[model samples]
Target chain A: GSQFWVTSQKTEASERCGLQGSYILRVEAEKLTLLTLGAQSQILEPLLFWPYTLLRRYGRDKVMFSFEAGRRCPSGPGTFTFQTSQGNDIFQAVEAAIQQQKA
Target chain B: TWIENKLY
Candidate 1:
């Protein structure tokens, strides 16, 4: 599991503020994971954030594509992601695999 | 960090 930092962007002296719930990241990402955080956090934070929280109790993820307006991952539907049962327990496995790959 | 972030 990963953490998301949520904050409010307060307008200058305005009681009105934008509550920005930074996107929910399901797993950790290295410097170069093929999976991208920008894809979801950018274009669809408002659209997907709340609903995804409800669904991901079952361990799923969703990504909404950005500027690339033509194609989609030929998997489930628009913006689809699947995490392993092990995804809930991926850090040690990831550490080992990364260590093995490096060593 | 997560507990600090109030996400727990």
Candidate 2:
């Protein structure tokens, strides 16, 4: 559901967003989202879902997720590295989402 | 859908 360290492969949008901090990963019925902390409220942003999204684990504490450019997401392909103590949980959540989409 | 209101 959350991760402490976050880094991206750096797309133009992600570079401008300065997305190298903590994040909350949300797995929804239709899509997966990432949220960043704000002053009082959180900034909700969509991280891509199935069809073109892919997720893979790196080590014990890291997972790299990516999504290709598509109609819903017209931007270039993007990859993000998420590091946390609960890497397996994050991996499973994304994996399950992908499975659900395939089903 | 569920919404979480906490920091990591």
Candidate 3:
């Protein structure tokens, strides 16, 4: 269940992560949970789908993030639970992005 | 609930 794992296994790091050499990861989601991604901008629907659409249509690491809110970590708005992920890369990137947006 | 591990 993966989109970008490894492209080659002969000598590429991607391959070492099970990209090539029978390590193909396939993610066939039975459903897609639309999660809002971006800074606190009224939490509009556009912002919600922006990252998600971007993630699926354009792919990852292009606009400083993948599925906007895919791998985000929340500090809580006095008790606001945010997102989680299998990897911290998304969260880390989003954190930086959120900060930059504020600046 | 069929929930899995969460990272956040």
Candidate 4:
């Protein structure tokens, strides 16, 4: 089954990081995965994951969202900017996952 | 910027 997926662009970064470039955000039942486009193969490589249980806080403004660092989760913390048309849907999917896990 | 800081 295909889970919710959306295209995103790396618009801003708080610090120098390897998370730049285009990305495909995958929202699954258990986690949210960020797949970045590989420079050579153009393949989408898994970059980051935030399990529903580990997501501490998330907030957005229009197309951009800041994902707080999850305790014990590697790769540190950062923000993401999704395509204008798909940002809301991504946010809704993540919110639902968090709520579902809590329930 | 404000939203990101607030969220953090």
- lDDT on C-alpha atoms for all candidate structures: 0.25, 0.44, 0.24, 0.56
What are the per-candidate TM-scores when only chain A is compared?
Answer: 0.19, 0.53, 0.21, 0.66
lDDT, model 3, position A5: 28
True-structure RMSD, every candidate? 16.0, 9.1, 16.9, 4.9
lDDT score, candidate 2, position A30: 42
Can you list each candidate's DockQ? Answer: 0.03, 0.03, 0.04, 0.12
The residue-level lDDT of candidate 3 at A94 comes to 35
Which stretches of model 4 miss by more than 4 angstroms?
A1-17, A38-42, A77-85, B1-8
Q: Per-residue lDDT tens digits of candidate 3, residues A1-103?
A: 1222222213232222222221112222321122232456534122111221122211223222122122231211111112223224433433343334333
lDDT of 1 by residue, A1-103 (tens): 2433222222321122222333333323221012223564653232222222111112211322111111221111222222223333333423333344343
| Clashing residue pairs found in predicted model 2 | none
Best by DockQ: 4
Better of 2 and 3 by TM-score: 2
Worst 10-residue lDDT window for candidate 1 chain A reads A65-74
| Residue-level lDDT for A58 in candidate 4 | 60
Over 4 Å off, model 2: A1-13, A42-75, B1-8
Query: Candidate 4's residue-wise lDDT over A1-103, tens digit each?
Result: 0243444455343243455445667777777787766889988778777675555566555655445555555655555445444555666777766556644
What is candidate 2's CA lDDT for residue A24? Answer: 67
Residues B1-8, model 2: lDDT tens digits: 12111110
Q: For residue A35, what is the lDDT in candidate 1?
A: 24
Second chain of candidate 2: TM-score? 0.29
